[PDB]
């Protein structure tokens, strides 16, 4: 159904391709040309996961594991039950993610708003793309992608992390992790200010932007503002996604030794006395 | 000669602060490179002497 | 003419004092370098 | 303690299931708190929809608005509802787009649609209106970037529709909000506001691409040149965004 | 293209905003010293306004310096007061926790005794800062969400260094005060107790850590997408919903079938961020005190994946084949 | 002496709170240092006396 | 003696909450450092007496 | 004559008297407790 | 004459007289405690 | 030397006294910590070594 | 003249006279502490 | 000579605090440099002399 | 006539006269300290 | 010859700062380059020359 104010926004137009052939809503969801392709790719990918789960012998969501082919297969196609199903699901997943981002473009174009959200999602797609196709392409085998399992893909992260003997020493991991712990820092404080101002102690008037502007001024000596927090906030999270993409694309295609060994440039600088 | 006109362009307080920071950092750097060399490290030379 | 709003007469007064300090700072450095060269020549 | 309560259900497993109950309650609490506006759902015809969702409406919460603006309970009749919308249904059923019956930007439907906010200016902590022109603002001046005052304004089709006479600032936050445009007699009659977020300021000009030259004469005006109400703010901003789809048929039609 | 509101293209600077006041008389303890930075003004507000310095703030600042200095003085003395070596090993040196042989007793100053004293000042410094957040909210007559969210972060902070070492019966379980050493502790902690990936609360904390960055990328992008409708003025959009709140809601309703309000978004924002250390604190508290091995816990509870392929490299290639000879 | 004029500069409220917090943190820190040593740890001395 | 004027500068409500939580935090900390001690752990000592 | 909390001299004077009564009562129990525990297991 | 925080010279005079009474009382207990500790276990 | 009293015209006595007090204690604590770190001037270790 | 903080010449002189008296007392204690320490364990 | 004009350009309040932190940091740094050398470490030399 | 800090030329000499007095006193102590440490363990 | 017109284009205050920064960095870089070489390093030559 609609909302109390949704009717005036459900106007014709704003599509990128397909026009009014697909321009309709199914329930609350907007269906476009890319909503059709999202439905096809997401359903095909989801079904193939359960088809692979059926032949794997278990339907347990924790134990479901669609793994990539062996490194011997290289960049070619593998038998569907020897890692080939993972390749098709990856194609379906990439097609579903791109369609989802392009569907968001149609939605925000129909609403006359900025394309920040589809761009921000594209960074998440890029982080997935650099994990499943870009890094395997550079390393010469599709078997370097993570498997499609709830807990099976954690073993890939653990093994790939220890494939460089201490993965915390990755300089791009440090930058990326610093962005996650700070993005959650910014989310906690930004969500707190609006809630604190809009929900004062009972029996007292709500506060405006000035009161929260002067609160962190009184708290930490500086306030970035109502608009600034969303601007730095998108940048903090986008940098978190981007630098996470960087830390894994340099682990193996650009750096093969241990990550602690990378910091040897700093230790043995000529300026440091022996 | 005629260099006094440099103060018609440069702010005396903005340059004196810059000169003071630059001069000390330059002095510290040269003292540091002297200590890096084994020949001019007066702390190590004193250790070598009378020992 | 004067980007700092400072008169020509003032600039000559400022430079004369500044040069006097510069030579005094350099005079100490000359003596300091002479002592170092005697103690440990680098040429 | 390293003993299992039963089978393999230890203290670690007990805490996990305790969090499952808390998270389920939290999800219910978070979703209901998200339903203070926009509900009941209704349908295309405007009648209340048969389906209302698994989550019930939350209990009413009361906001004590400042500056003597009364109380506010979000769950209830919405004063921002717009009536006499100029739209018609393209299908007799639900889930289909509405076709505007006239000029979508003039009627304010779709990307050009505004909301019936309060017809009073937003006020800062002191009480006076939040957004004021720099001429009225005391002690304010440009500190960085290009000053848009005096630069010509270029529309989406390249037409020069006037020059920026003044720009409105949020003196509470020291942020630029709008730019006044002194519309040329060939294009408009008086002064129109454009939000800072829809105008790109260049070295020699300010360019707004959403609105063509012929649409500036229809930009909503303000009752007074010293302040802008929330209703005028909502009408002005929505008009420019509506041009992103309604400036020409090419924008509305699919790009491929 | 259209102006993406990422950097402000024109800045206006007026009289410095000293802040609001009420009968609590905030202005007594404010510094009344303001500065404007045009570099930070491109992305955010440019005023480096006055900071309210109370007694919780001063005590936290003073005691935090003592912890900072005691750690620093030890690190400097660890390298024999060699400043070039201290700078070179700055990321490697630390104030290591006490040896496990001392239990919860006070260890010698060189073997973690200064660690406890430095930790004591850090604990006082962190709690004092939290009290400042609580007191400032009470004196500003606003909600205590900032203090409550901070307390969630302190919960993991207290569990890591105070609660779990007490429950484990040894001060050696604390985290070393070093850049790399607390990374080594993070890796060693996972290895010692099995695999922390298989800790459900570590997995749960990652869900909210991922969700926090996911939401705050979504919220940041959505607000910037509707900032052309004054969406950055969220508070005025809560008391009087404009088209910015409507389009932001309808964008996510048409995308994923449900949305939030301009106020309800921050409740999602607050709780996902707050649940990140709360679940992490529980997961760390259950590590060693209860479990001591998480992968075996996963195997026992039947959610550890099982692999049928062989493990050696000889099963997939040869040494000569890998070398290309 | 004329040390009574220090209160003409320092606020009596501020010093007493600072003096109270500083003295307790001093006493706690000094006591912990004694516990660190093996010759002045009175808890360990009692054990060694039995 | 004359210390009754200490309340002329301190808020009794503000002190007592700080003066109250401090005593319990002190008492809890003192009680725990005896538990960590072998000679004064009354819980572990009763087992020794029982033998 | 001087008060930073808005209390007169006599009002704070009786505030202290009742306060010390709690302080002496608290210390009296503590003195007995330390005296009792020193007899039990002395630390000196 | 000069009073940054406000109270008169006479008020500051009586404030210090009471303050030193507490300071000397605090030091007197500290000296006795230090004297007793040195007899129990000297550190010199 | 005898005219050093003019330093209180340049400096606010309130903030300098606070700065001096914090610096003096931090100096005293730092030097004691340096002495404790040595193998010869650790008066706590010497007391144990003498018994 | 030249009062950056409002203190007059006599007020600054009076404050410095007390400050010097406090400084010398602090220094006198330091010398005695340093004198005793050197006798106990000299560092030269 | 006539270097008193430096106070017409430099604010006496700002320089005095600037040189105060600089002097102590320089004095502390040079003392630490001595402590990093075997020859000039007066703390470690007292231990050797006593033995 | 030149002044960026508002100090009069006449009273700048007054401040600098004391500042030299502090400088020479600080330097005189440094010379004695440097003289003492050179006799102790020379660095030349 | 008539190169003096460059000041009509370049702001004298802007170019002087840029030239001063450029000249020192160029001088410092060249000095550091000579130290890198094993033939023009005057610090290491003095050690070798002194035998
Ligand atoms: C053609 C399809 C193409 C794609 C297919 C392929 C997709 C494969 C995966 C599919 C996964 C499910 C996707 C959603 C299914 C469709 C939903 C739908 O059509 O409407 C539902 C339908 C409403 O019909 P409607 O057409 O939307 O009409 C409008 C409403 O009447 C108006 O009522 P309203 O205004 O109150 O809003 C209604 C809203 C009401 O619902 C809500 O309000 C949602 C709020 C809670 C969600 C946020 C919390 C999640 C964040 C943390 C999650 C991680 C936690 C981890 C564990 C933590 C500790 C427990 O319903 C929704 O639309 C929410 C849908 C999204 C639900 C959450 C999606 C999954 C997230 C969790 C992942 C689970 C793994 C799934 C993998 C399954 C693979 C087989 O009824 C429901 O609302 C039930 C909710 C459905 C839950 C199913 C979730 C699956 C598990
Ligand atoms: C032994 C393990 C090593 C380690 C090895 C690795 C490895 C290996 C990796 C990381 C990577 C990451 N590590 Mg590390 N790392 C370690 C320790 C840590 C610690 C810590 C506190 O100890 C932290 C915080 C991190 C943090 C992180 C981030 C930098 C990053 C996480 C992925 C990412 O950003 O998302 C990016 C991922 C996406 C955005 C997913 C995209 C989602 C798609 C587009 C949408 C999904 C839709 C889907 C179908 C769901 C829809 C279904 C329902 C309908 C909703 N690491 C340890 C030391 N780390 C990972 C990384 O960077 O990946 C790029 C990586 O590969
Ligand atoms: C080999 C590495 C192990 C590992 C070992 C651990 C350990 C060990 C821990 C985590 C924990 C965390 N891990 Mg893990 N983790 C690994 C792999 C990962 C991966 C990944 C992609 O591989 C990711 C994304 C994560 C992600 C996370 C976060 C979800 C979580 C931290 C919560 C939090 O916000 O902390 C942020 C909180 C803080 C930083 C502490 C609070 C700080 C206080 C309040 C601030 C005081 C400031 C101080 C005074 C300094 C102030 C200075 C200022 C300048 C003034 N881990 C692998 C399995 N992980 C934590 C956890 O379990 O949570 C349940 C944890 O303890
Ligand atoms: C800036 C980077 C951050 C980010 C941003 C981000 N993500 C986004 C967006 C944005 C701005 C959206 O607008 C979009 C959205 O609408 O979210 C609600 C989205 C989104 N990112 C999501 C989740 C998500 N975000 C993550 C992280 C991040 N995304 C970063 C922290 C992660 C992590 C860390 O893993 C996840 C899981 C979704 C909720 C949504 C994308 C919805 C989507 O793609 O829908 C189409 C597809 C389907 C409905 C199902 C497709 C199924 C496939 C065909 C088969 C399976 C493939 C997959 C590889 C399975 C693997 C499973 C195992 C790994 C367990
Ligand atoms: C869990 C979700 C996120 C989170 C939440 C969170 N953190 C928070 C809050 C919240 C909600 C606050 O309200 C609070 C705050 O005030 O934020 C601004 C805070 C905070 N958490 C912080 C950081 C932080 N957040 C972290 C993580 C996170 N916490 C997540 C990202 C981490 C990590 C990764 O562990 C850290 C380190 C602080 C910035 C802040 C409060 C800490 C604080 O101020 O403690 C008091 C200490 C001091 C004032 C001094 C500390 C030491 C100084 C560096 C010493 C001085 C040095 C200087 C050179 C002087 C030298 C003098 C000598 C030479 C004499
Ligand atoms: C590594 O370092 C190692 C070696 C480990 C280390 O430990 C380093 C040690 C170091 C550095 C020692 C530093 C200690 C110092 C400097 C000691 C300061 C201590 C002082 C100064 C003691 C004041 C006591 C006064 C009080 C506390 C109350 C007075 C009480 C009265 C009651 C006040 C109120 C009076 C009234 C009359 C009432 C009010 C009246 C009116 C309102 C009218
Ligand atoms: C070995 O290599 C490494 C290790 C790298 C190294 O060490 C490198 C070392 C290097 C580079 C040394 C660099 C140091 C230099 C150059 C030292 C200059 C420093 C100087 C000179 C500072 C003197 C300050 C003393 C004064 C001046 C006190 C003044 C005291 C008085 C009391 C104040 C004045 C008071 C008044 C004015 C009253 C107010 C008056 C009125 C209100 C009227
Ligand atoms: C048989 O035995 C024989 C063989 C005899 C024998 O023993 C051989 C020994 C032999 C040969 C001695 C070899 C040693 C020698 C030679 C020692 C080097 C001597 C040195 C290094 C001299 C230091 C003086 C430097 C100062 C003290 C500068 C003070 C700097 C001032 C303070 C300026 C900074 C202040 C400012 C204000 C400027 C900034 C300006 C603005 C900010 C505007
Ligand atoms: C191996 O090589 C390595 C190490 C790599 C390397 O990099 C080599 C180093 C290299 C290449 C650096 C190149 C060095 C250079 C270029 C040296 C610059 C040094 C200069 C220029 C000396 C200025 C001295 C100025 C003073 C000190 C004035 C004193 C001022 C006095 C105090 C007066 C102040 C004013 C007043 C008192 C009042 C005035 C006001 C009125 C009258 C109103
Ligand atoms: C690696 O480094 C190693 C080697 C480790 C190292 O240690 C190197 C250490 C290094 C370099 C630090 C060298 C320290 C220095 C230089 C600090 C000298 C300290 C000085 C100078 C200050 C002391 C005296 C201050 C008092 C204590 C005044 C008494 C104040 C009184 C009490 C105030 C009374 C006043 C009034 C009541 C006002 C009257 C009011 C009216 C009339 C209204
Ligand atoms: C230039 O200045 C000088 C000065 C020279 C200098 O060097 C500057 C200092 C420098 C460079 C040091 C740089 C510091 C660094 C890198 C430290 C990083 C720090 C890190 C990563 C922190 C890890 C996390 C630790 C936890 C998680 C703690 C939690 C524990 C808390 C505190 C709980 C309380 C614990 C207790 C035990 C209670 C004790 C109390 C009683 C027993 C009552
Ligand atoms: Fe927000």
Give the three-state DSSP class for I28.
Answer: helix
Cα separation of A34 and E146, whole Å?
41
Preceding amide of F11 cis, omega within 30: no
Q: How far is the CA of F7 from the centre of ligand 2 (A)?
A: 59
Distance, in Å, from the CA atom of D227 to the CA atom of A254, rounded to the nearest integer, reads 58
**Are the CB atoms for E76 and J36 separated by under 8 Å?**
no
Instruction: Give chain L's length.
Output: 51
Q: By C-alpha distance, which of D187, D186, D146, D181 is closest to D164?
A: D181
Residues whose CB falls within 8 Å of the CB of residue M20, separated by 6 or more in sequence, listed in order: none
Strands D152-154 and D191-195: unpaired
Q: Which chains touch B (3 or more CB pairs under 8 A)?
A: C, L, M, N
* 3-class secondary structure, E36: strand
Q: How far is the CA of I22 from the centre of ligand 6 (A)?
A: 9
* B2: nearest CA partner in chain C: C12
User: M15 CA to chain B: closest CA distance, Å?
Assistant: 18
Contacts of E137 (CB under 8 A, 6+ apart): A196, A215, E143, E144, E145, E146, E147
Q: What's the C21 CA to ligand 12 centre distance in angstroms? A: 58
Identify the residue whose C-alpha is closest to ligand 1 atom 16.
E257
M27–L contact, CB cutoff 8 A: no
**Contact at 8 Å (CB) between A195 and E270?**
yes
Q: Hey, of J5, J12, J19, which one would you mutate to test binding to chain K, going by the most K CBs within 10 A of its CB?
A: J5
Nearest to B37 among N13, N16, N43 (CB): N43
How far is ligand 4, taken at its centre, from the CA of residue A34, in Å?
A: 16
Atom of ligand 8 nearest to the CA of B23: 39
Pairing of strands D206-207, D152-154: parallel
Structure tokens at M32: 């004695």
The candidate with the shortest Cα–Cα distance to E287, out of D2, G23, H3, is D2
- CA dist., res. A217 & res. A190, Å (int): 14
F32 and chain J: CB distance < 8 Å anywhere?
no
- Determine the distance from the C-alpha atom of residue D45 to the mean position of all C-alpha atoms in its chain, rounded to a whole number: 25
Residue D39 to chain A, least CA–CA distance (Å): 6
- Which residues of chain L neighbour M4 with C-beta distances below 8 Å? 8-9
Chain L residues with CB under 8 Å of E83 CB are: 29, 32-33, 36
Ligand 7, residue L16: give the atom nearest the CA.
33
Instruction: Tell me the C-alpha to C-alpha distance, in Å, between residue E325 and each of A66, A139, E7, E319, E320.
Output: 33, 20, 56, 9, 5
Tokens of G28: 């809890």
Evaluate whether D58 touches D32 at the Cβ level (below 8 Å).
yes
CA angle D89, D92, D97 (to 5 degrees): 35
Local structure of residue E162 (DSSP, 8 states): I
D256: exposed, middle or buried (C-beta count within 10 Å: 0-12, 13-18, 19+)? Answer: exposed
* Index of the ligand 3 atom closest to the CA of residue E284: 62
E48 bridge partner residues = E35
Q: Which residues contact E287 (CB under 8 A, 6 or more apart)?
A: E164, E189, E193, E196, E199, E294
Cβ–Cβ of K43/L12 closer than 8 Å?
A: no
- Residue from D166, D163, D184 nearest D226 by CA: D166
Task: Write the burial class of residue G51 (CB in 10 Å: 0-12 exposed, 13-18 middle, 19+ buried).
Answer: exposed
Interface mutation target, options H7, H8, H18, H44, chain G, most CBs of G under 10 Å = H7
The encoded tokens of residue M42 equal 């020379």
Atom of ligand 1 nearest to the CA of D39: 35
Using alpha carbons only, how large is chain H's radius of gyration in Å? 17
| CA-only gyration radius of chain J, Å | 18
Cα dist from D103 to D96, D186, M11, whole Å: 20, 21, 77
CB of A220 closer than 6 angstroms to any ligand 5 atom: yes
Nearest Cα to B16, choosing from C25, E237, A54, J47? C25
Token reading at M29: 């102590």
Strand partners, A251: A255
Greatest alpha-carbon span in chain C:
49
Q: How far is CA A237 from the centre of its chain?
A: 10
CA nearest to E239, candidates D36, D164, G38 = D36
The radius of gyration computed from the CA coordinates of chain B, to the nearest angstrom, equals: 19
Q: Which of C29, A116, I23 is nearest to E2 (CA)?
A: A116
Question: Which of D10, D115, D200 is opposite residue E290, by nearest beta carbon?
Answer: D10
Instruction: Name D160's bridge partners.
Output: D154
Residues with Cβ within 8 Å of L35's Cβ and at least 6 positions away in sequence, in order, are: E80, E81, L41, L43
Rounded distance between C-alpha atoms, residue A244 and residue A242, angstroms? 5
Q: Is residue D152 classed as helix, strand or coil in its secondary structure? A: strand
Percentages of chain K per state (helix, strand, coil), in multiples of 5: 75, 0, 25
Closest ligand to residue A172's CA: 2
Residue of N nearest to B29 (CA): N28
Q: D256: which residues sit within 8 A by CB, 6+ positions away?
A: A16, A17
Q: Determine the Cα–Cα distance for residues A185 and E152; give it in Å rounded to an integer.
A: 11
In sequence order, the β-bridge partners of residue D114 are none
Farthest CA pair distance, chain G: 58
Residues with CB under 6 Å of ligand 1 are A 1, 27-28, 39, 42-43, 46; D 20, 23, 27, 31, 51, 53-55; E 204, 207, 257-258
Of D156, D170, D164, the residue nearest D194 (C-alpha): D164
- Chain L residues whose CB is inside 8 A of the J36 CB are none
- What are the Cα distances from residue F36, in Å, to E110, F22, I30? 9, 21, 21
The answer to whether F28 contacts E55, with C-beta atoms less than 8 Å apart, is: no
Residues of G in contact with F46 (CB under 8 A): 39-40
Whole-number Å distance between alpha carbons of E187 and E32 = 46
What does the DSSP assignment read for E107-127?
PPGGGTHHHHHHHHHHHHHHH
Q: Is A94 in the pocket of ligand 2 (CB under 6 A)?
A: no
Nearest-CB residue to E10 (from D145, D195, D233): D145
Ligand 11 atom 4 nearest Cα: E69
Phi and psi angles of residue J35, each rounded to the nearest 5 degrees, phi first: -65, -40
**DSSP 3-state of E259:** coil
Q: Which ligand is nearest to the CA of J36?
A: 6
Q: 3-state DSSP call for residue D229? A: strand
Find out whether A104 and A125 touch, Cβ atoms under 8 Å: no
Residue ranges of alpha helices (H) inside chain L are 6-9, 12-35, 42-50
Residues 6+ apart with CB under 8 A from E4: A114, A116, E224
Dihedral sign computed on CA atoms, order A236, A241, A246, A248:
positive
Distance N28 CA to ligand 9 centre (A): 15
The C-alpha atoms of residue D89 and residue D91 are separated, in whole angstroms, by 5
What angle do helix axes E113-139 and E145-158 make, rounded to 10 degrees? 170
A75-80's contacts with Cβ under 8 Å and 24+ in sequence apart are A75/A136, A75/A137, A75/A140, A75/A141, A75/A142, A78/A142
Documented resolution in Å: 2.7
Per the CB < 8 A criterion, the answer to whether J40 and L46 are in contact is yes
What is the Cα–Cα distance from A181 to A237, expressed in whole angstroms?
A: 10
Residue E50 to residue E47: CA distance in whole angstroms: 9
**CA geometry: angle at D160 spanning D159 and D163, to 5°?**
160
Quick one: which H or E segment has residue D193? strand D191-195
Beta-carbon-side half-sphere exposure of residue D246 (alpha carbons within 13 Å): 27
Comparing CA positions, the residue from A210, E248, E231, E220 lying closest to residue D198 is E231
Minimal-distance CA residue to ligand 8 atom 20 = C32
Distance CA A238, CA A121 (A): 9
Cβ pair J12, F9 in contact under 8 A: no
Residue with tokens 């006499």: D84
Of K7, K41, K43, the CB nearest to J9: K7
Residue F41 and residue E107 in contact, taking contact as beta carbons nearer than 8 Å: no
In degrees and rounded to multiples of 5, residue B36 shows phi and psi of -65, -40
DSSP track, chain A: ---SS-GGG-BS---SSSTTSS-EEETTEEE-HHHHHHHHHHHHHHHHHHHHHHHHT---TTT--B----GGGTTS---IIIIIHHHHHHHHHHHHHHHHHHHHHHHHHHTT--SHHHHHHHHHHHHHHIIIIIHHHHHT-GGGSPPB-TTHHHHHHHHHHHTTS-GGG-HHHHHHHHHHHHHHHHHHHHHHHHHHHHS-STTS----HHHHHHHHHHHHS----HHHHHHHHHHHHHHHHHHHHHHHHSBTTTB-S-SGGGGHHHHT-TTS--
Q: In which element (H, E) is residue D142 found?
A: strand D141-145
From chain E, the residues in CB contact with L32 under 8 A are 76, 81, 83
- The verdict on the CB of residue A152 being under 6 Å from ligand 4 is no
Ligand nearest to the CA of D38: 1
Q: Which protein residue has the closest C-alpha to ligand 3 atom 63?
A: E280
Ligand nearest to the CA of A152: 4
M44 touches ligand 8 (CB under 6 Å):
yes
CA–CA separation, A178 and A175 (whole Å): 5
As residues whose CB is below 5 A from the ion ligand 12, the structure lists E 234
Q: Which residues of L touch E82 (CB under 8 A)?
A: 36
M12 → closest Cβ in L4, L39, L40? L4
Strands, E, within E31-75: which ranges? 35-36, 47-48
Residue A144, annotated ligand binder? no
CB atoms within 10 A of CB L43: 17
Residue J17, φ and ψ in degrees, nearest 5: -60, -40
């Amino acid at each position: 159904a609609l909302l109390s104010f949704e009717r005036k926004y459900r106007v014709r137009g704003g599509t990128l391709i397909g026009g009014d052939l697909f321009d309709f809503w199914v329930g609350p969801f907007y269906v476009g040309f890319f909503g059709v392709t999202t439905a096809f790719f997401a359903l095909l990918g989801t079904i193939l996961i359960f088809w692979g789960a059926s032949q794997q012998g278990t339907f347990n969501p924790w134990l479901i594991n669609i793994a990539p082919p062996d490194l011997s297969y290289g960049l070619g196609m593998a038998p569907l039950m020897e890692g080939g199903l993972w390749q098709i699901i990856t194609i379906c997943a990439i097609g579903a993610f791109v369609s989802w981002a392009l569907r968001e473009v149609e939605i925000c174009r129909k609403l006359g708003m900025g394309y920040h959200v589809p761009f921000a999602f594209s960074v998440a797609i890029f982080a997935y793309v650099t994990l499943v196709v870009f890094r395997p392409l550079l390393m010469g085998a599709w078997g370097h992608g993570f498997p499609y399992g709830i807990w099976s893909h954690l073993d890939w992260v653990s093994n790939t992390g220890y494939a460089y003997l201490h993965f915390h020493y990755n300089p791009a991991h440090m930058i990326a992790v610093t962005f996650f712990f700070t993005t959650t820092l910014a989310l906690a404080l930004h969500g707190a200010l609006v809630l604190s101002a809009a929900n004062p102690p009972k029996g007292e008037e709500v506060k405006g932007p000035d009161n929260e502007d002067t609160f962190f001024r009184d708290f930490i000596g500086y306030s970035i503002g109502t608009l600034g927090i969303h601007r730095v906030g998108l940048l903090l999270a986008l940098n978190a996604g981007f630098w996470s993409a960087v830390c894994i694309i340099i682990s193996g295609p650009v750096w093969t030794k241990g990550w602690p060994e990378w910091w040897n440039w700093w230790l043995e600088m000529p300026i440091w006395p022996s | 000669s005629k260099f006094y006109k440099i103060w018609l362009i440069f702010d005396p307080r903005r340059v004196f602060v810059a000169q003071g920071v630059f001069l000390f950092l330059l002095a510290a750097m040269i003292h540091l490179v002297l200590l890096s060399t084994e020949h001019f490290n007066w702390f190590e030379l004193a250790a070598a002497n009378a020992a | 003419l004067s980007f700092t709003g400072l008169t020509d007469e003032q600039a000559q007064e400022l430079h004369s004092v500044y040069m006097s300090g510069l030579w005094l700072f350099s005079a100490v450095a000359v003596v300091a370098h002479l002592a170092t060269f005697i103690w440990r020549p680098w040429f | 303690m390293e003993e299992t309560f039963f089978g393999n259900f230890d203290l670690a497993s007990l805490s996990l299931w305790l969090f499952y109950g808390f998270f389920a309650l939290l999800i219910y609490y978070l979703q209901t708190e998200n339903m203070r506006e926009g509900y009941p759902l209704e349908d295309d015809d405007g009648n209340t929809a048969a389906n209302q969702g698994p989550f019930p409406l939350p209990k009413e919460k009361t906001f004590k608005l400042q500056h003597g603006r009364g109380e506010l309970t979000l769950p209830g009749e919405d004063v921002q509802r717009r009536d006499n919308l100029a739209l018609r249904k393209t299908a007799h059923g639900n889930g289909f787009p509405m076709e505007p019956t006239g000029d979508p930007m003039l009627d304010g439907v779709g990307p050009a649609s505004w909301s019936k906010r309060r017809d009073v200016p937003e006020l800062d902590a002191h009480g006076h209106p939040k957004i004021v022109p720099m001429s009225a603002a005391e002690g304010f001046g440009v500190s960085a970037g290009t000053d848009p005052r005096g630069l010509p304004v270029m529309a989406g089709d390249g037409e020069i529709v006037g020059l920026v006479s003044d720009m409105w600032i949020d003196e509470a936050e020291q942020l630029v909000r709008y730019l006044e445009i002194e519309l040329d007699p060939e294009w408009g009659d008086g002064k129109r506001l454009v939000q800072r977020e829809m105008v790109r300021i260049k070295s020699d000009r300010v360019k707004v691409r959403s609105i063509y030259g012929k649409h500036f004469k229809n930009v909503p005006k303000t009752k007074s040149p010293n302040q802008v109400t929330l209703l005028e703010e909502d009408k002005i901003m929505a008009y420019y965004a509506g041009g992103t789809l309604y400036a020409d048929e090419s924008r509305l039609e699919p790009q491929l | 293209p259209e102006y993406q509101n990422i950097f402000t293209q024109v800045q206006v600077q007026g009289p410095a905003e000293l802040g609001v006041d009420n009968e609590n008389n905030l202005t007594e303890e404010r510094t009344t010293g303001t500065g404007f930075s045009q570099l930070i003004g491109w992305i955010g507000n440019a005023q480096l306004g006055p900071i309210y310095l109370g007694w919780f703030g001063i005590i936290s600042l003073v005691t935090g310096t003592l912890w900072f200095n005691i750690v620093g003085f030890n690190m400097l003395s660890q390298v024999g007061y060699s400043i070039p070596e201290f700078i070179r090993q700055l990321f490697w040196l630390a104030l290591e926790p006490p040896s496990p042989e001392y239990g919860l007793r006070m260890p010698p100053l060189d073997d973690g005794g200064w660690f406890i004293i430095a930790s004591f000042f850090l604990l006082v410094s962190v709690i004092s800062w939290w009290l400042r957040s609580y007191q400032l909210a009470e004196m500003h007559k606003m909600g205590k969400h900032v203090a409550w969210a901070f307390a969630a972060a302190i919960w993991l902070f207290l569990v890591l260094g105070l609660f779990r070492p007490i429950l484990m019966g040894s001060w050696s379980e604390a985290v070393p005060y070093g850049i790399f050493p607390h990374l080594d502790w993070t890796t060693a902690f996972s290895i010692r107790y099995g695999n922390l990936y298989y800790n459900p609360f570590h997995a749960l904390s990652i869900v909210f850590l991922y969700g926090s960055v996911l939401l705050f990328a979504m919220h940041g992008a959505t607000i910037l997408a509707v900032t052309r409708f004054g969406g950055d003025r969220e508070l005025e959009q809560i008391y009087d919903r404009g088209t910015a709140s409507e389009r932001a809601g309808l964008f996510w309703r048409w995308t994923m079938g449900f949305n939030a309000t301009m106020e309800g978004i921050h409740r999602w924002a607050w709780w996902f961020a707050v649940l990140t250390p709360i679940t992490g604190g529980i997961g760390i508290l259950l590590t060693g005190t209860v479990v001591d091995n998480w992968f075996l816990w996963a195997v026992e509870h039947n959610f550890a994946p099982d692999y049928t392929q062989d493990y050696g490299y000889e099963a997939y290639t040869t040494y000569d084949g890998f070398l290309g000879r």
